[PDB]
Design a protein around this ligand. Sequence first.
Ligand SMILES: Nc1nc2c(ncn2[C@@H]2O[C@H](COP(=O)(O)OP(=O)(O)OP(=O)(O)O)[C@@H](O)[C@H]2O)c(=O)[nH]1
Ligand SMILES: Nc1nc2c(ncn2[C@@H]2O[C@H](COP(=O)(O)OP(=O)(O)OP(=O)(O)O)[C@@H](O)[C@H]2O)c(=O)[nH]1
Ligand SMILES: Nc1nc2c(ncn2[C@@H]2O[C@H](COP(=O)(O)OP(=O)(O)O)[C@@H](O)[C@H]2O)c(=O)[nH]1
Ligand SMILES: Nc1nc2c(ncn2[C@@H]2O[C@H](COP(=O)(O)OP(=O)(O)O)[C@@H](O)[C@H]2O)c(=O)[nH]1
Ligand SMILES: [Mg+2]
Ligand SMILES: [Mg+2]
Lengths: 429, 429, 432, 432, 131
Amino acid sequence: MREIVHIQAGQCGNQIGAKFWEVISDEHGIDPTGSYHGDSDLQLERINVYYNEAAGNKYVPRAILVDLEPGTMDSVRSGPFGQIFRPDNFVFGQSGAGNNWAKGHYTEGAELVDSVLDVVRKESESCDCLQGFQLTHSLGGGTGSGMGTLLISKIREEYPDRIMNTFSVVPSPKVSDTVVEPYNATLSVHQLVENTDETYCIDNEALYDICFRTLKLTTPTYGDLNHLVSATMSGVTTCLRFPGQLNADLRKLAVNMVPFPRLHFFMPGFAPLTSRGSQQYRALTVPELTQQMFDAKNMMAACDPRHGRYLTVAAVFRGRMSMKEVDEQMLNVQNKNSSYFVEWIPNNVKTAVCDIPPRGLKMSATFIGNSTAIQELFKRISEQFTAMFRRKAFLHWYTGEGMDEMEFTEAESNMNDLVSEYQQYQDAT
Amino acid sequence: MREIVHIQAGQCGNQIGAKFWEVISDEHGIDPTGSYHGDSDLQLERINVYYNEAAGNKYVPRAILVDLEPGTMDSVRSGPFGQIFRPDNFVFGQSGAGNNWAKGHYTEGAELVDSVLDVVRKESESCDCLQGFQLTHSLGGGTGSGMGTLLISKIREEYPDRIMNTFSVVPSPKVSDTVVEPYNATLSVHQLVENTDETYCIDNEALYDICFRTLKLTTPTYGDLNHLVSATMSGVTTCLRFPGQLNADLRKLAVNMVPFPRLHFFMPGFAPLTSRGSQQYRALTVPELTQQMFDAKNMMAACDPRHGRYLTVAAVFRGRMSMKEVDEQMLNVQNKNSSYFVEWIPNNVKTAVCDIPPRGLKMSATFIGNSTAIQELFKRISEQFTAMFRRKAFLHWYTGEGMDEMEFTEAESNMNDLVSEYQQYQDAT
Amino acid sequence: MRECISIHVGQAGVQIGNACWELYCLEHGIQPDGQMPDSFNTFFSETGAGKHVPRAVFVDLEPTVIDEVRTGTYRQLFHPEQLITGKEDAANNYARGHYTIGKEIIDLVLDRIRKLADQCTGLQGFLVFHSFGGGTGSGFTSLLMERLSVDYGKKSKLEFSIYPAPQVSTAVVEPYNSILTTHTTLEHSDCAFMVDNEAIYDICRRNLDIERPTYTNLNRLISQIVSSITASLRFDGALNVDLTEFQTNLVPYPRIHFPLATYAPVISAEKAYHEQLSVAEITNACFEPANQMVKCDPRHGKYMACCLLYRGDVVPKDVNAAIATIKTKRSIQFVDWCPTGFKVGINYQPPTVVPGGDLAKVQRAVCMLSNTTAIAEAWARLDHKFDLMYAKRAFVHWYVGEGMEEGEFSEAREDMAALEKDYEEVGVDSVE
Amino acid sequence: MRECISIHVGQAGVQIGNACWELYCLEHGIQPDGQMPDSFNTFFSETGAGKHVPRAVFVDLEPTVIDEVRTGTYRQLFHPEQLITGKEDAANNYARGHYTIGKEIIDLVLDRIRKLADQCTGLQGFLVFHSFGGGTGSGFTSLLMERLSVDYGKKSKLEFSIYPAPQVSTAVVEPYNSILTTHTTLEHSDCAFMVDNEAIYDICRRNLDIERPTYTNLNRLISQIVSSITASLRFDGALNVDLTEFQTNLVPYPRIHFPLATYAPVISAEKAYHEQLSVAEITNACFEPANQMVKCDPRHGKYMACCLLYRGDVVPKDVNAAIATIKTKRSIQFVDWCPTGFKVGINYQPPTVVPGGDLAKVQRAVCMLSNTTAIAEAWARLDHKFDLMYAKRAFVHWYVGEGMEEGEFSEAREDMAALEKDYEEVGVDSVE
Amino acid sequence: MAVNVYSTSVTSENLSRHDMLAWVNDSLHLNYTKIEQLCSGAAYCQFMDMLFPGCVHLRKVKFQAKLEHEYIHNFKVLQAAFKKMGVDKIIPVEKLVKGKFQDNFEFIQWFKKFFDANYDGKDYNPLLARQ
Ligand SMILES: Nc1nc2c(ncn2[C@@H]2O[C@H](COP(=O)(O)OP(=O)(O)OP(=O)(O)O)[C@@H](O)[C@H]2O)c(=O)[nH]1
Ligand SMILES: Nc1nc2c(ncn2[C@@H]2O[C@H](COP(=O)(O)OP(=O)(O)OP(=O)(O)O)[C@@H](O)[C@H]2O)c(=O)[nH]1
Ligand SMILES: Nc1nc2c(ncn2[C@@H]2O[C@H](COP(=O)(O)OP(=O)(O)O)[C@@H](O)[C@H]2O)c(=O)[nH]1
Ligand SMILES: Nc1nc2c(ncn2[C@@H]2O[C@H](COP(=O)(O)OP(=O)(O)O)[C@@H](O)[C@H]2O)c(=O)[nH]1
Ligand SMILES: [Mg+2]
Ligand SMILES: [Mg+2]
C-alpha cells in the first residue's frame, strides 16, 4: 500500500535520482543487481513503496527516467546501480532542448511525452494503492523545466486525487548557470503553482555553503551535493516505510504545511551535519539536532528565514528518542523566537518520529519550513525576467518555437501575484 | 482420436511448416530421426494427433508437403528435421506457378492436385477419428494461394463434416512483396470465405515490428518470424494434446469465435515475448500476460483493434495457474475497455487452460481475436485490386491461362460484400 | 532439375557469353577443362566421367570470334557441336542476318537446341544474348526467336541486349537494324533487358576509377547482372524468384516488355573500405539515376514495376525498411494503376569475384530490374534517327538487294510509332 | 548518437581541419590508418572491419592543399569521396567563389553531405571552417550556407572563421570579401566564432615564448578551442553543454551572433612548472584582454553573454567562486538587460597534448565564448576600409567581370551599416 | 511560375500556433484543433489548388484519410505538384506522416511563407474542391 512513483527529468533530475536510488537501495538492503541482502524483516516489510518485485527474488525501482538527449541516461546505465533499473523505464529522445523551456514543453518534449505517459500509466496500474508522484528536476534548463512541467500537467490531469510533489533545483542569487534561466524558471513556476501539491526548493548555492562551512569539505563534488538532497528525500518518506511512534506520511505533511493552496513552496533542511574530525567533540542529542535544524545557515534555499516569518514548520525525526524531549524542544523554539513565526496559526510546528534511523547514525532530523522569506527568491527571478523581457532579449528562441509574448506576460503576472500573496500573509495580524 | 492432417503449400507454406514440425517434435520429445527420447508419459499419450507410429519405434508427421517447384522441398529435406518426413508425402511439380494464381489453381496446380488428393485420402484413412485439416500458405503467391485454395476446395468436398483451418500469410500495407499480390490475395479470399471454417491472418509487417520493438532483435531472420507463428500454432492445439483444467479444442474455439459463417478471419497473438536482458526485470504473472495479449502492438495482423470492435476473443493459457485469477483478468479487460467490445454478445471472452506449459516457460498465452478492424485489410486489398483492374494491368497473364474478367469481377464483389458485412455488425446495436 | 539454356548470338553475345561462363565456372568451382575437385546442374550437363558441359549454344555467322573460344583457355569446357559458325557475316545488315545468310544455318542451330532440350527434365527456358545493331544480333536473332516461338512457345524467353547509345555509335545503319529487329521480335519475346555501353563506361570511370575501360570490363559487369538473375536457380535462398516470375512481375502489357537492369555496389578496393555498404545504402544507390546502365532519365519517367534481387549477407526486415523509405521519396514516382510496385528476392550467396576483376569483394549486392516510361525517350530518339535516313532512302538499296521489301521499312516504322503511343497512353493517370 | 559533421572550406579551413583531425585521433586513440587497438562515434563512422572514418568534408576549389591531405600521413584516415577539389581557385574573388567557379562543385559537395547525414541517427548539425578573406572561404562558403539552410534549416550551424586583423593583412581585396560574405551568410548562420591571426601570434610570442610561430602553431591552438567546444559530446562530464545550447545562450538578437573564443592556460614546460594554475587563476586569465584571440578591446565594450567551458580536474564550487569574484570586478561590465550572463560547462577529460606541440600538459583548461559590443569596433574598421576603396571603385571590375552587379556592393554595405547601428543600440542602457 | 523561401533565424515574422491554426481554418473552411492534423496532406493539397489553378488531381486526394498509407498517398500528390511548379524544398514525408508536432510546425511555417510569396488574392471556395 501507498506506492510512490518516482520521475526524473533532464540532467539534474537524473543525477539526483541516481543518488536517491543508491541511497534507498542501501537503506532497504538492496544491492546493484536488485537482490535483497539485508539483515532485518523491517527492511522488506514496506519495500513495495519504492520497488516492484520481479521474478527470481529481485526488486526494481518504480522509477521512470526521462531526457531529450541520451548522454546522461547512458552514464546512469554505466554507473554503480545503473543495472537495477528497468530498461523499458528509460525514455530518451535524440534531439535535446538546447536550454529552451519552449522546446521541452511544446516541441521536442511534446514528441516524447506520450511515450512517457504510457509507461507512467502502466506503473500506476501495477500499484494496489498509488500514493502519488515525486518528480526531480531543475527549473533553469529546458528538459527538467519544460518537459517536466508538461509531465506534471498530464499526470495531474490523469490522477487528480493523488499527491504531486517535486524536488526542484532552483536558480541561485550570486551566479547563474544559464543565461536564459530567469525565463525557464518563470515559465516553470507558473505551472508548478497550478499543478503541484508541494514543492521542495533546493539551491546549489546553499548546498555548496553547507559543504564548505558545515561539512568542512574544501573540494565538494556534485555527488556530495546530491547525497545531501537524497538524504532529505529519504527523510520525507521514512514514516511511510518504517514503523514509528507518531507516524507521518505525504498527505499529513501537506495538510500541516499548506494552509492555502498556492503556498506550497518549502525550504528543506537536514541534520546532523559534521566533519570527520569535528564529530567526536559533540553529543548527538535531540536539542542539538533541533538547534541545527532551526538556524538559517542550514536551509537549502538561498533565502534567510530571519527576513520573513515561518507559516508552518514540519520536523521529522528518525531514531529511538524521547517524545517529551522533542515536544519540549519544539515548544522552546516557538516561544523564544516568537517574532519569526506567524501569530495567527498557533502551534505551527508539526512533529513526526520514525523509529528506524539512517545508516551510520543513532539519530537524524529533517526539517520542512514554509517561510514567507522564500518570496525573496521569487522577487529576484521576477526582476531578472523583467530586465530581459523589457528588451525582448533571447525572445526569438522561444517565439521561434510557436510561443507568444502573451504567455510570457501572464507568467510574469502570476509570479508577481504569488509574491503579493506571500507578502500579505507576512504582514497579516 | 482427433487426428489432425497438416498440409503445406508453396515456399512460405513449407518454410513455416518445417518450423512448426521442429517445434512440435521438440514438444513431444521426438528427435530428427523420429525416435522418442522424451522424459514423461504425457508426451506420448496424445502423440497420434500429429504423428503416425511406424515400425521400429519411430514417429512420422501426418504432414503433406506441396510445391509446383522442387527447390524449397529439397532445402527442407536437407534441413534439420528434414529426414523425419515421409518421402512419399512430398508432392512436387517441376514447372512452378510464376507468382500467378491462375497457374496454381487452374493449370500447373491442376496437373498436380489429384496426386496430392490421393495422398490426403490415404492419410485420412489412417486416422481412427479425423478432426480435420490445417493448411499453411500465403495468399500473395501462386502456389500457396491458387493451388492451396484448390486443395481446400477439394478436401472440403471430400470431407465436409471435418474442420478446415488455415494459417494464411497476408499481404502487408506498407510494402508489397509481389506486384500482382492484390490479384492473388483477392482470388484466394473468395475461396477462403466459402471453403474454410477458420482463417488465422498473419502479416510479416506485424511480425517484424514484434521482433524489433518487443523481442529487441536488431536483425531478425525469417526463421525467427516463423518460430513466432509456430508458437501460435502449437498454442491453438495444446488442449487437444495435453490434459488441462478447462479443455478446449478446434471445434469449440470455432463455435465460440464464429457467430456468422463468413466472419471466420482471426488475428492471432502470443505471450510472453521479452528480450534476453529485459526478462529478468519482469514477473511472469497472469495479469501481465493478459495485458500483453490485449494490446494492439502484439497482434500479428496489420490492423489496429482500436479501429474496430472485438466480436469474440479466445484466450488459451498454458501452465499451472489460478482459474479465479484468469476469470478476474478476463472480466477486467471487458469492463474497462467496454467500447472495444461489441455490446450485443455478452461475455464475448472464451477461456481455455492447458496444464502443460511450453518448453523453457512457467506460463504462456495465446490470443485469438475476431475483430471488425480486420475489414481495413480487406478494404486495402480491394482498393489495390481496383487500381490495377480498372486499367486491366497484368490481366493477360491470367486470361492467357483461360480465366475471364467475370471471375475477377465476382471476386471483387464478394470481397466488398464481406467488408460490408463486417461494417454492419461493427455499427449494430 | 530447373534447367536454363543460354544462347549467345554474334560478337557481343559471344563475348558476353565468354565472361558469363568464366564467372559461372568460378562460382561453381568448375575448372576450364569441365572438371570439379549439385545446383550447378541447371547450367551444366554432366558426363559419365567427372566432367561438366555448359547448357549453351554460341552462334556467329563468321568464324573469327568463336575461333577464339575454340583455341582459348575454355576450349575443353564447350562441346564442339555447341560452337556454331558460318563462313560470311551479316555485314551490319538485318536482311543478311534474317534471310540471305541466316536461312543457311538456322536449321543447324535449332537442331542443337532440340538436342540440348531433350536432356532437360525441367527446362525453364532460354537466355538469349545479342545486340540490336549488328546484322547477326538483329536479323539472325529475330529469325531464331520466330522459330523458338513456334517449336516451344510457352517456355519463357529472356533477352539481354546491348541497346545502342544516344551519342555513342559504332555503325551508321544501327537505327535501321534496331528498328527492324525490335519490330520482328516484339510479339515473340516475353521480356527484354536493355543495357547501354555508354552508361556502363561512365560507371566504370566514375564509380570504379578506371581511366580506360575495355569491352572486357563491360562484359564482366554484365555477367554480374546475369549471375544475380540466375543465383535464385543456382543457389539456395531465403525468398526466391524463378525465371517465369520476372515476366509476371515486370510486364504490365504485352508490348511493354523492356525493363532495365541496375547493379550496386560497383566499387574498387580503395573505396570498398572506408564505407559499410548497408542494404539501405545500396538500395538508395540503385534508384539514383547515375548508377543506371541505360542512358535515360527516370526522373522524367514513371516506374511501372521494380524487382529487387538482393544477394549475400542480407536481412529481410532491413530490405523492407529500405524499400519503404524509397517509396516516400519525391524523385521516385510510380504509375497510378500500380499501388504495389516491388517484387523482392533475397539469396544467401554473396557475389563472387573473378580473379583480376575490376570490382571489389562485397558482403552484399543488389540487382534491380525496373520498367519505366522514361525508356520511351530512347524509342523516340531511335525513331527520329530512322526518319532522317529513310526520308533520303540512305543505305536502303543494301537491304532491298538482300531480298527485303521497302514496304517492310514503313511497316516496322509504324509498329514502332504505335509502341511509342502505347507508352505515352500508359504514362497518363486514371480518370475519376 | 549525437553526431556532428565537420566541413573544411579553402586553405585555412582545410589546414585547420588537418590540425583538428590529428588532435581528435590522438584524443580517441585512432591511428592515422583509421584503426584503434565508444564516444568517438559522434565524429567517426565505423566500418565492418575495425576502421573509423571522420564525419567530414574537405573542399577547396584548387587541388594543391587537399593533395597534401591525399598524399600525407592521414591519407588512409579519410575516404576519397570526402576530399573534394576543383581545378581553378576563386583567386581572392567572392564572385568566383559564390558564382562562376562555385556553381560547378556545389552540387557535389551537397550530395556528399546528404550521404554523410543519411548515416547519422541523431545529427546535431554542422561545424564549418573557413576564412572571411579568400574567394573560396568567402564566396563558396556563403553559397554552401544558403543551400544548407534550404535543405536542412533547423539544424544548428556553427562557423569558425579566420577574421582579418586591423594592421596585419594578407590580400588587398580582403575587406570586399569579408563584407560580402558577412552580408550573404548573416541570415543563414546561427553563430559564428571569430578568431584573429594577429592575436594568436601575439599570444604565441608572449605566453608560449615562441620567437617565430608558424601557421601550424595557430592551427594547433584553434584545434584546442574546437576540442573544448566538442568535448561535452565526445566525453562524459559533470555539467554538460550540447551544440544547440550555445546558440540559445550566446545569441540575444538574431543579427548579433558573433561571439569570441579565448583559451587558458597557454604555457610552455618552463612556465608550466613554477605555478599551480587554479580554476580562479585561469578564469581571471581568460577575461584579461591580453589573452584574447581577437584584436579588440573588451574594456571599451560591454559583455552580453559569457559561456565558460572548463575541462579536466575541476570542482564546480571553485568555478562558482571564481565567477563570483569576476562579476564584482570593475573592468568587466555587462549590458543592463542581462543580469545572468554566464553559462558554465564542466567536463572531466583534461586537454590532451599533441606530441611535439608548443603547449604544456595541464590538469585543467578553460575555453570562454563571449559576446561583446567591443567587436563592433572591428566592423566599423572593416566598413571604413570598404569605403576607401569603393569610393574609387578600386578592383570592382574584377567582381563585375565574374557576374556580380555593382548595386550588390552598395546593398552589402548598407546591411553592414545597419548591423553596426544594431550593436550601438544594444550597447545603451534601458530607460526608466 | 513559383518561388522558394527559407526560415531559420528570424524575429517578428512567425505566427503563433493559435494564429496559424486560425488562418488555416479560415482559409480552407476547416476545424482543426491540433496543428498535427495537417500531417494528412489533404489541407496542403487543397492549398496548392487554391494557389495554383489546376496543378493537382484533387479527385485522387483523400480528404478524410485516417491511415498512414492514405497520408503517404496525399503527400505523393503534393510532391508531384511541387515538381510541376519547380519548388525545390524537400518535404520530409516520413517525419510529417507520423504526425509529429515539431516537423509539422516547421513545415507549416515554410508553407505560409511560400503561400504569401505566391498568393494573388483570388476568391476560392474550398468546399467545391472538396466535394
Ligand atoms: N557490351 C559489349 N558490347 C559489344 C561487344 N562487342 C560488340 N559490342 C556492341 O555490339 C554492337 C555491334 O554488333 P556486333 O555484335 O559486333 O555485330 P554482329 O552481331 O557480329 O553482326 P555482323 O557483324 O553485322 O554480322 C555495337 O553496339 C558494339 O558496341 C562486347 O564485347 N561487349
Ligand atoms: N589561422 C590560419 N589562417 C590561415 C591559414 N591559411 C590561410 N589562412 C588565412 O586565410 C586567409 C586567406 O584565405 P585562404 O583560405 O588562403 O583563401 P582561399 O579560401 O583558398 O580562397 P582563394 O585562394 O581565393 O580561392 C588569410 O587571412 C590567411 O592568413 C592557416 O593555416 N591558419
Ligand atoms: N544539485 C545539482 N544540480 C545540478 C546537477 N546537474 C546540473 N545541476 C544544475 O541544473 C542547472 C542546469 O540544468 P540541467 O538540468 O542540466 O538542464 P536540462 O538538462 O536542460 O534540464 C544548473 O543550475 C546546474 O547547477 C547535479 O548533479 N546536482
Ligand atoms: N512469414 C514468412 N513469410 C514468408 C516466408 N517466405 C515467403 N514469405 C512471404 O510469402 C510471400 C511470397 O509468396 P510465396 O509463398 O513465396 O509464393 P508461392 O510459392 O508462389 O506461394 C511474400 O509476402 C513473402 O514475404 C517465410 O519463411 N516466412
Ligand atoms: Mg560480326
Ligand atoms: Mg586558396
